[PDB]
Each structure stands twice: as C-alpha cells, then as structure tokens.
A = this chain, B = another copy of it.
Amino acid sequence: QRVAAHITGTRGRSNTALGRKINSWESSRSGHSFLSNLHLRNGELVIHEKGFYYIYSQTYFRFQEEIKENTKNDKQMVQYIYKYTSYPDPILLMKSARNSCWSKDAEYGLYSIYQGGIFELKENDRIFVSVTNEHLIDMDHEASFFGAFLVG
C-alpha cells in the first residue's frame, strides 16, 4: 500500500523543458531501485495516487577535462525537475545549479547535485529530470538517482 519509488541510473555499479531529459533510469525492481504504486514511462515517474509528494534527484557530474584553447570552459551544471500535468507544456518544479572551477589548473571535476521538495500532484501527472551537460553525467547506479514518495 506504500507509495514510493527510487530508480537509478543504469550503466552499472560503481568501482569497488530546459536541459536534456534523462530517460535512462531503471524501470524495474532491482537491488537498488523499486516502484511501489508509481511507474516509469519514458524516464518519467507516473503518479497513480493524488497527494503531496517529496520528489528528489541526485545527478553526478564527473569530468576529466582538458583546458581547450580557443574557447570558453566555464560549465553550468543544472538539474531541473519538471512535471507534466493536464496542460500542454512542462512546468518546472525545482532547479539546483553549480559552476565548474575557473582555475586554469582544473584537471577534472566532480559535482554531485541533489535537491528535493514536496509538491501536490494529481493522478496521471508525470514528473521527470532534465539536465545540462548530460555528456558529463555519471550514470552509475549509485552516482545518479531519482525518486519520490507520498507525504502527510
């Protein structure tokens, strides 16, 4: 009867609308993701039950950059959590942002971005995660994830 979910970035386990919608999340039960009274459909969590939902997402920006010459290197990593209600356009719920180091000596960067919040969603609503610089995201099942659960 619980209503919650946490689905992770596939790709494998770690070593031992603006932006671009992330559609590679898992959609099946695993040892690190589940969907209880919610389901994934094209990278979007589909709500079944109306109510207040704490929604969250973590996205790992990990790059081993090289200072490119005739170009700017400043990076804006931003994670957007959108919703699709009975209205044509996607409505932004929250965004969290970072900027890489401006040091010409930067050799690489690791920027995990997490954010979460509660929003009232109606049945059939749909929520998803979007991001800039997706070619820099590390989708290991532990680095990046997405979930939501009922509250009240």
- Chain A residues in the interface with B (C-beta under 8 A): 1-6, 13-14, 16, 18, 31-32, 34, 36, 51-52, 54, 56, 58, 60, 62, 74, 76, 78, 91-99, 101-120, 142-143, 145, 147, 149-152
Which residues of the partner chain B approach A60 to less than 8 Å between Cβ atoms? 95-97
Q: A4-B151, A36-B52, A149-B54 are in contact. Are A110 and B93 (CB under 8 A)?
A: no
Q: A4-B151, A101-B101 are in contact. List 4 more A-B contacts (CB 8 A).
A: A94-B143, A95-B142, A98-B112, A99-B111
Which of B18, B96, B99, B107 has a CB less than 8 Å from the CB of A114? B96
Which residues of the partner chain B approach A110 to less than 8 Å between Cβ atoms? 76, 78, 97-99
Q: A52-B2, A151-B4 are in contact. Are A101 and B103 (CB under 8 A)?
A: yes
Which residues of the partner chain B approach A108 to less than 8 Å between Cβ atoms? 74, 99
Which residues of the partner chain B approach A101 to less than 8 Å between Cβ atoms? 99, 101-103
Would you call the interface of chain A mostly helix, strand, loop, or mixed? strand
Which of B51, B98, B114 has a CB less than 8 Å from the CB of A111? B98
Which of B13, B58, B115, B145 has a CB less than 8 Å from the CB of A112? B115
Considering the chains assembled together, what is the distance between the CA atoms of A97 and B113 in angstroms?
A: 9
Contact call B151/A32, Cβ cutoff below 8 A = no
Which residues of the partner chain B approach A18 to less than 8 Å between Cβ atoms? 16
